[PDB]
Amino acid sequence: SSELDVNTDIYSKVLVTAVYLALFVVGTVGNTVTAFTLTVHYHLGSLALSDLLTLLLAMPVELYNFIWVHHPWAFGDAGCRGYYFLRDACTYATALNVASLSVERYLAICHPFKAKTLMSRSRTKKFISAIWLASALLAVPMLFTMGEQNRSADGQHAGGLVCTPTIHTATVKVVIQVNTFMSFIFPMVVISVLNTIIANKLTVMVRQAAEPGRVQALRHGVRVLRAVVIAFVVCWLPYHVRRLMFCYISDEQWTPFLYDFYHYFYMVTNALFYVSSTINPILYNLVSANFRHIFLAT
């Protein structure tokens, strides 16, 4: 009956939850004030909203039955599906919002005129609504794949059931493999390429100028424009590589030591994943003073 437990240290749970709460009190407020503060404005607001919902949805529910010591699922069979669907939808929203924000910055800095028509001003609201809809549309498998299962050998214990991939490991593997490319590799490459070319366009300006803060401003601009990609790497790659080590490795290799190591890796990867939610308004403040004025005023 009690074969499905995890032996991660309780003090580790306390530390993880404290860090989670700190990141929450940061992001949940920062992203909301950013959304209120507000073509790039629409993209920034959409990204802030995606981060805000990620923190509001993933962190709390996971904090007890996943990010705590109790293995039995406590949100019900419907919760088994709703939690994962919401998590996947918010992850897609964040990744695609970052990609679209990079695209918008590219258009503004490299195509100043035609961007007015292509962005079509107020139609950027419809564009961000479309990206949110696509994010919600790409996460349907999280509804009918993570359902409650009677996993315990007894089948009637106090924790015999828990939310797990229903389908065979092959289908879980293929769905996760498409998910990683559609949510990490594609946005990652788009962001990296566009940010690199924008940084080149800023460096040519810096060379041409080579002012009191113009040089400093452009230097910090390129610094942050690269730190964005570095933060994407750090915050996102661990999550997807953990999911890969979950889905790809079959029953042959699994051992209690690696089992517990993966469980701790869960805490580490999720902490890194949530760090990205808070990182955004920090960089927004560190970049632009005009935005910082309203942000600190409000």
Binding site: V162, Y259, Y266
Partner: peptide, 6 residues
Amino acid sequence: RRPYIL
């Protein structure tokens, strides 16, 4: 054993 939490 095998992990149940994705």
